[PDB]
Structures are given as C-alpha cells and as structure tokens.
C-alpha cells in the first residue's frame, strides 16, 4: 500500500542434465450451415427497442440493449428480449396470473421512459420515448 505523508521506502537502508540422455548436446546428431429455430411458434404482438437493467441486491446493473417482444402462443403469453448484434436471450418470462409490473423509476430523470418488474432467476427494469413505454405497459398489463 501507499501512504500519503510517507517518504517512499525506495532506497531506505537500515549438475544440470548430467545423468541424462540429451545431455549429450550436438553429439546426439466442423461447422456446417444449419437452421436454428427461434423456438417461437407464437406471434409477436408488440416490439420495441429497449434497454434492460437488473438488480439482485447494491445495485442496478446494465444487462442488454435490444428488441423486447411480447409473444402470443397461438393458444399463454411470454416476454422475449434479445441483445442487439450478438442476439443472445437476455429476457424470457411467461406471463402468469398475479404478475406485478409497475410504471416509473424515480431515481432517474428519464424515469417516465421506465418500467419495472419481478422475475425468476430478482428484478428487472426496462427503458424505452414515453409513448412507447406506456404501450409496452398496457400491452403487458392486458395479459393474465
């Protein structure tokens, strides 16, 4: 460690290979094109470009930016989100009965662009333009 007042402690004061054979020295002279399935035999109702955060205890961490999707399963509803570019799944949630989705986030100026949420492995925060954050809310709310 370094200590603020202290002078730097800089200049203070106060038989290899023998038994062995070499030893001697010079004397020894597919990927193939596939199809992946989205895993979607559902229909995409609403989609918007979004930013996602997660909190598991301090504090909120970024998680991904991408298209969040609400999918209707040609019957059940779920939320599907993917990271832009690399396109990994960063959010995948069945819309079950007794589901809590709150508008707003206060500790952020843009908080009217925000929405919060609770899910199986902690909580998530989505961000969207205000008009689209309400759309996402009502479309989510409508379900189950």
């Amino acid at each position: 460690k370094f200590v603020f007042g202290a002078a730097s402690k800089f200049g203070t004061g106060f038989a290899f290979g023998s038994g062995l054979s070499f030893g001697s020295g010079f004397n020894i002279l597919l990927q193939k094109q596939e199809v992946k399935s989205g895993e979607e035999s559902e229909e995409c109702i609403y989609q918007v470009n979004a930013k996602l955060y997660q909190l598991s205890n301090e504090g909120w961490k970024e998680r991904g930016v991408g298209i969040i999707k609400i999918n209707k399963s040609k019957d059940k509803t779920r939320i599907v989100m993917r990271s832009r570019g690399i396109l990994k799944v960063i959010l995948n949630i069945q819309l079950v009965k007794g589901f809590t989705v709150q508008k707003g986030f206060t500790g952020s100026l843009q908080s009217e662009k925000f929405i919060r949420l609770l899910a199986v492995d902690a909580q998530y925060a989505i961000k969207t333009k205000k008009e689209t954050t309400d759309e996402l809310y009502n479309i989510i709310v409508k379900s189950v």
Partner: protein, 189 residues
C-alpha cells in the same frame, strides 16, 4: 458442438476483462481490478452454422501478474490483441504481444482491437494504427463502454473458424420459461 479456445492479450488497463464482462453479463465494469494470470470464461452464441463456443482465456497484461505468460497460448485456435487508443504505450506494445502469441500459435486468426474509442481526447490516431496490415490481422476500433463494434471481433473470428464468410449471428433459441427501496437508487449509465 465444437469449442474454440480464444486468447485475449494486451497491456493492463486496456479493457480486456471489461470487454469479456460486457459480453458475459451485459454490465459495464467501471473499476480496474487487474487480472492475475488468466481467467477462463465459456462464451457462446448462435449462427446459421449453429452454436459457436469460445473458451475465452482472459490474460493479465501487467508484467508482475503475468503468471504462465505465453504458456497460456498453447492450443489457442484464435486470439484478440487489445490496446487503448487513449494510451500510446499500449499500442507501442502491440508487436510484443503479437510476437509472443505467434511464436506459440503459428497460423491462427487474430483480431487487433483498439478500445475506448468513446473517449474524446484520443491519443493513438487512426493513421498510426498500421501494425495489423503486414501481419494479416483484422483491426477494429471498439468501445466496451458504448458497445461500438463490440460484436465484430467475434463475428470475424467465427467466420474464419467456420471457413465461411456466409456466417452471421442468428437468434439464440428462446425455450419455455421455468421494490420501493430500489426506485431511488442511481443508475450506472
């Protein structure tokens, strides 16, 4: 499903671990915690040539935390070399990292990444960054902070490994799924 070992090398502070963490968790690590030796992390995505799996070997760039050094490169099938466009010395050191790497891995695809391009006062200018040309390395200006080009090293590397520039990312399969104290916490960004 094959797995490809990716070694990640370069001077300390250049954003290697921050870059892996970005890809792994989505988070942006603000602190500099120097890596000690190496840290290994699996990392995958899907393409139209199926799933691509990297074993990312995130090495220490500080000489005192060097560990097995070039012993980390044995059997790498690809690599990323990272410097910090904010720091001249890190680009001046790019040939040393490249020298140690190719002595161990003769014929592997290697991406040169100039990171932190989001910083206003850039110090290593575009016209200085020539090293990759004679060495047949791909070069990208990236930012782990803004996500600029941060998927590109992986796409290029996967295209080399599959031997098919037709390769593209596709959507990973989405399979069946299984407060008040927070609202006023600050947000990282």
């Amino acid at each position: 499903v094959p797995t490809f070992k990716l070694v990640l090398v370069g001077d300390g502070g250049t954003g290697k671990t921050t870059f892996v963490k970005r890809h792994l968790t989505g988070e942006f690590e603000k602190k500099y915690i120097a890596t000690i030796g190496v840290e290994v992390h699996p990392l995958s995505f899907y393409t139209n040539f199926g799933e691509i799996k990297f074993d990312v070997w995130d090495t220490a760039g500080l000489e005192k935390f060097g560990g097995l050094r070039d012993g980390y490169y044995i059997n790498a099938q690809c690599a990323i070399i990272m410097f910090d466009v904010t720091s001249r010395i890190t680009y001046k050191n790019v040939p040393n990292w490249h020298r140690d790497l190719v002595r161990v891995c003769e014929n592997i695809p290697i991406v040169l990444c100039g990171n932190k391009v989001d910083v206003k006062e850039r110090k290593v200018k575009a016209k200085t960054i020539t090293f990759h040309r004679k060495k047949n390395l791909q070069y990208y200006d990236i930012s782990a902070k803004s996500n600029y080009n941060f998927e590109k090293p992986f796409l290029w590397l996967a295209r080399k490994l599959a031997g098919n520039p037709q390769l593209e990312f596709v959507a990973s399969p989405a399979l069946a799924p299984p407060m008040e104290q927070a609202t006023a916490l600050p947000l990282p960004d």
